[PDB]
Symmetry: D2
C-alpha cells in the first residue's frame, strides 16, 4: 500500500544485511538503567538488550525507552536474554548484584554475587564467545578477576570499570586548577577501586611537563597542599555520593559509556580499567586498575608506567590483600 | 603557583563575563532526574539548577551528576532555588507535584498540585520575569493554564509538554511504515494530552503528499486499518508505560529536552506543545496542544491547520471539558 | 620497539578486517577538489581515491589533503585509478569533462564528454559492478542518461546531481521568508537542470499546509510576487555564479556531499536527483530530476507527485527536448 | 502575508539582538578560499566577511559559498571590508600577500608584503581594536612580528599560524607508529616555520611516558632511526606540497580553522602558534612558535618547556637570524 504516495523502484536492490553493533546490559537496577539511558542518548549501539528477572518494571522501562527513541538516534532497544536476543553480542555489561543484608559478612556478599555471576557467565561463554565483558558490580576488582576465572576468556576481553571514573575527575580537577584543556593532562588513579586507590603523582603530566619535576618532597609547600587537596576532593566526592544517595548511578553510567566508546570505535584510548596483572611490578594473579590502551578487541596494550617506590608499595599491598580475599571465597 | 609548568602571559586580557544559558528544574523526582540526566548529556545549558525540598538525596543526585561531568560537555550543575541560584534563568522546567492518595478525588489532586504551583510561581514571577516556563506536571493542559493565570506572563512564554512526545512517536511510526526519513512526515497529534488526543489525519503529509488525498472514507480498507493501528500503537505505548512502570520518565525526559533545544537554539521548529488557545476553532480560555513554531521567546507562531469537521468537534469537546474542570477548582 | 612505553598484551586478538566505506572521485578540477575537501572535512568515507590524469598537481593536492588530515576525522585519502586503488568502491563520483572550445558546437562538446565517459565507465563496470555512480558533469541530465546506457547498471544506481542544489536553496529561501525551520518545508525544483527547471508550486508544503491552498491564480497578488521572486532569486544565483566566477565548485561540492550522506548512511531521504523516468507523466527513455527516496542502494522510491497541468506540460517539454538532443549524438 | 499558513502570536516578544561571532578573511587567494570553505563547513562564525580587491571572482566566490549554505549550518557570508562590514570582528585572518617576481630579492618580497600589511592593519587598528589577528602570510614569523610592531596590539592578540600544522602531523605520525590515540601524544615542533623548525624530542611524551627517557644518545639505534624518520616525513610532506602543487591551501586552511576553534570556543588548548618571545631562553624582540595555551583572548599562557642544550641552541640561532632579517627591512 501507499504506492500513491511513494512509488517503489523495481530496479532497486534489497538493502544490505549488515551486522549490528550489539550490546547487552545484565542487571537493570539504578546502575544498569543509568547506563542504558546514557548509551541510548549517545547512540553507542545499533541493538541494545536489557536482561534482568522477568518483571513489569523491566518491560515498562524498555517501553519507556522505546517511546522516547524518536528524539535521539535510533537504537533497537529490547528486553531479552543472552541465550536468545543477546547472542553474539559485541559487549556484555554486567551490573547485576545483590545488596548487603543486615549483618551480612563481606565474604558472604561476595559469594552471593559470585554465584550470580556463575549463572550469568555460563550463558555468556556459550552464546557470546567473542564478546568483551565489562564488569561494573562492586567490588569491581574482585568481580573482574572472578569473571576471568569463570569464563576462561582471554584476559584482554575481561574488563572492569575500575578507576576510570575517578581518574577522569582527577584529570579534570587538575586541569581546572591550571586553566588548561583537560585533554592536555595525563594523571592516573591506579590500584584497587575504593579508598585505597593510588594517584600516580610521580608521572602526572601536563602538556609534556611533569607536575612533579623531581620528587614530591622537592615541591613547594603550597603546591603540595593544593595537589593533595585535589585528590582528596576526588575521594570525598565518591564517598559522599554513597553517603548521601546510597550509591552512584549517573557517574558510573557515564564512565561505563565512555569505556564502551573506546571499544566500539576502536579509539585505542588510554583508560585505567581494571584488568589482569601479568608481571608488572611483580604482581600476578589479581585484577587492578592500570592505564591501558583499549580498542575493539579490549585491552590491547599497557602503559608501562615507572612508579615511585612509595607508589609501588601501595600497589603491591593492594594486590596482596585482594589475593587474600579471593582465596577465602 | 604552577608557573614552572604554565607561564602566564602578562599582556593577556581577562576573559569575557558572558551570560550563561541557564535553566532550573523544579521537582527532582523520577521525571526531573530523567530530564536533568538528558539535558546534561546533550549539553543544553551552561548552568543548571535543581530545586526540590532539602534532602540528602537531592544533594547526592547533584554530586552524582557532578562526578560524572568529565565524560560529557561541561555544565555548572548545582542544587539551589529560584530566589538564589536560579535568578534570571532562561527556562524554568516544572515537574513538581504529588501523587494521588488512596481514595483522593481528581479535583483534590489538582487543588493540591495547584497549591504547589502557587508557591513555586511566586518566586518565578519575582526572580525570573523574562523566563519561559515549561510545564510537565500532569494533567499538563490544566497545569499549563493554571501557570498562565497565576503568573500573568505573556501566553507565548507559558509552554506545556503537551503531545510533543506522542506526536514524535506518531511521526516516526508512520515513516517506518513507508521506509522514509521521519523528517519528511508532518503528522500531528493535537488536543488534550491523554486518551482523548486527536490525530490530524486530514492534514497528515509525507514529503508534500497527503496521506489522505481526499477524505478518510475514500481510503482503501487496508490503509485505513494500517493507519488506525499506528495511532493505536502510540496510545497503547503511553498507557502501557503507566500500567507496567507506573509512570513515564525517560520518554518525557527526552521530549522535554527536545522542547528546550528548540527554545535555546532559536530553531523556529514546529512542536505540538500545550499553550493558550486564542480564537482558533472558536476555542478560548483554555490550553490545548496545537502545532506551533517555538523559538527563543517561546510560542512565536501557530500552524493554521484546517481540521476536518470530525477532528474539530473532538477538539472543541476537549476544550469544553477542560474549561469545566478548571472552573470547579 | 617502544615496548618500554607501551607493553603489548599477549592475549590481545588482532583487530577485525572490516570493509571500508570507499569512494572515488574522477576528475579533480575545481569541482572535484571542492567535493574532496568537503567529503574529507565531513568524514564521508573511510577511504577516498582521487582519479585524474597523472600530474604533479593531483599528487600535490593529495599530499595537501593528507598533510591536513590530523585536524579532521581520519580518511585514507590517496591518488589512484578504478582498476587498482578504487576496486569495489561504494560510490563513484564523476566530475570529469572538458571545457567548450572557442566556437565548438554544443553537440561537439557532448560527444567529447561522452567519449570521456566511455573510457571511464568501462573500468567502472569491470571493477566497480555494485557501485552507485554519482554523475556531476554538465549537462547532468544528458550525462546521467549516457551513463545509464553505457554501463547497463540498474537505473536505481545511476544518479545525477540534478536540481538538489537549487531545491535546497529554494527550500531555505522559502522558510526564511516565513521565519520557520527549513526542515518543515517541502518545495521541489524538478525537471531539467538549468534555466528550464520547474518549481512545483502546486504541491509546495510548509509543515503540512499548502503554500497554494487552491490554485495559483487564487493567491493574493503580493504573495504571488513574493513567491515568484524567491524562485527567481534561486535562478539568478545559479546564473550569476557562472557569470562572475565562470563555474560553481563550492555549492555543487556541498550538494554532492549531501547526496553521498543519504546513500552511505541509508537515510531514505527525499532528494531531487536526476534519474531515469519510467512511466510517470508518460515520460520514458530520459533522465530528469524528480523527488526520490535515496538510500544505500540508490534510488529506492519515487515521490508520486501530482503536478498541475501547467507544471506537467513544462516537464514533458523538457523531456522531449532532452530526448531529441541525445538522439542527435 | 502567509498568515493563512502561520498565524503570528501577538504576545510573542521580539527576538534578542545577540552579538554574532564575527570573522574576516583578508586575501581570498587559494589559501583564503580554503580557509573560508573549511570555516563555513565547520560552522566557526555567525558572520564571515571576505575582503580582497573588488573583482567578479571574489563576488562569484561569495555567491558560490552563499548558494551552498543550505547544506551546512548557517553563516552570514559576505564580501566587504574592515571599515564597513567587518567592524568589531572577533578574529581577523590575514592571508594577503604577493608572489615573488622573477629575480626578486627575498628582502624585496618582504618589503612588498609588509607594505601590504601596513595598509591593511591601519583599518584593523581603527575599526577592530579588540580583535585577535591571525597571521598566515609567509614568512609567518616575520609577518607576525611586523603585525605586532605595526598594530601596537597586546602581544597576546597577535598570533601567527606558525608550526601548528607540522606539529599536528608530527603528533599523528608518532601515535600511528605506536597504535595509540593521537590525543595521548604531546610532541611539539617549535621555532621558525620552515626547514629549520625544531622537534622537541627531549620532552616528547606519550600518555605520561617520555619517548626519550634519558638522553637521545641512550636510545636504541632502531628507535633513533624510526623517530628521526617520522620528523623527516613531516618535513618532506611540507616541502613536496610546495614542489608538486606550488603552495599549500587545504592543509594550512584546516590548521588555521583549528586555531580559530580554540579561540572562539575558549578551549584553552595547547598550540604551537607563532608569537612574541618575552624572555624565555633569553630570546627577545622576535616571533617564534612555542607551545601556548590559546583561548578567547589569544595567547593566555606559555608551556614552560625545558629544552635540551642542543634544542635550545637551534632555537636561539633561529631567533638571531630572524632578528637580523627584520633589522634589514
Ligand atoms: Tb566474529
Ligand atoms: Tb582561573
Ligand atoms: Tb619494582
Ligand atoms: Tb533580559
Ligand atoms: Tb520495510
Ligand atoms: Tb470551524
Ligand atoms: Tb557486495
Ligand atoms: Tb523576519
Ligand atoms: Tb498527466
Ligand atoms: Tb568588547
Ligand atoms: Tb600497527
Ligand atoms: Tb638556557
Amino acid at each position: 500500500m501507499f504506492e500513491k504516495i511513494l512509488l517503489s523502484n523495481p530496479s532497486a536492490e534489497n538493502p544490505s544485511s549488515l551486522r549490528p553493533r550489539k550490546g547487552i546490559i545484565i542487571g537493570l537496577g539504578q546502575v544498569g538503567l543509568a547506563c542504558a539511558y546514557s548509551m541510548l542518548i549517545q547512540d553507542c549501539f545499533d541493538e541494545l538488550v536489557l536482561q534482568d528477572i522477568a518483571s513489569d518494571k523491566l518491560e515498562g522501562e524498555v517501553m519507556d525507552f522505546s517511546h522516547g527513541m524518536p528524539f535521539i538516534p535510533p537504537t533497537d532497544i529490547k528486553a531479552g536474554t543472552i541465550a536468545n536476543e543477546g547472542r553474539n553480542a559485541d559487549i556484555v555489561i554486567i551490573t547485576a548484584g545483590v545488596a548487603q543484608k543486615e549483618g551480612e559478612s563481606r565474604l558472604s556478599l561476595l559469594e552471593r554475587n559470585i554465584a550470580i555471576y556463575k549463572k550469568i557467565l555460563a550463558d555468556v561463554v556459550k552464546y557470546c564467545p567473542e564478546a568483551i565483558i565489562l564488569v561494573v558490580t562492586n567490588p569491581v576488582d574482585i568481580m573482574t578477576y572472578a569473571t576471568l576465572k569463570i569464563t576462561g576468556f582471554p584476559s584482554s576481553r575481561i574488563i572492569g570499570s575500575g578507576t576510570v571514573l575517578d581518574t577522569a575527575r582527577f584529570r579534570t580537577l587538575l586541569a581546572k586548577e591550571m586553566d588548561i584543556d583537560p585533554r592536555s593532562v595525563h594523571a592516573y588513579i591506579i590500584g584497587e577501586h575504593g579508598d585505597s586507590e593510588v594517584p600516580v603523582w610521580s608521572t602526572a603530566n601536563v602538556g609534556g611537563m611533569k607536575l612533579v619535576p623531581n620528587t614530591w618532597a622537592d615541591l613547594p609547600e603550597d603546591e603540595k597542599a593544593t595537589l593533595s587537596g585535589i585528590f582528596q576532593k576526588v575521594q570525598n566526592a565518591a564517598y559522599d555520593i554513597i553517603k548521601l544517595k546510597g550509591y552512584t548511578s549517573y557517574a558510573i553510567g557515564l564512565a561505563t559509556t565512555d569505556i564502551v566508546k573506546a571499544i566500539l570505535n576502536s579509539q585505542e584510548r588510554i583508560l585505567t580499567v581494571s584488568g589482569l596483572m601479568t608481571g608488572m611490578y611483580g604482581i600476578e594473579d589479581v585484577c587492578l586498575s592500570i592505564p591501558r590502551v583499549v580498542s575493539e578487541r579490549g585491552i590491547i596494550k599497557t602503559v608501562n608506567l615507572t612508579l615511585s617506590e612509595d607508589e609501588e608499595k601501595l600497589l603491591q599491598q593492594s594486590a596482596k590483600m585482594l589475593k587474600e580475599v579471593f582465596d577465602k571465597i
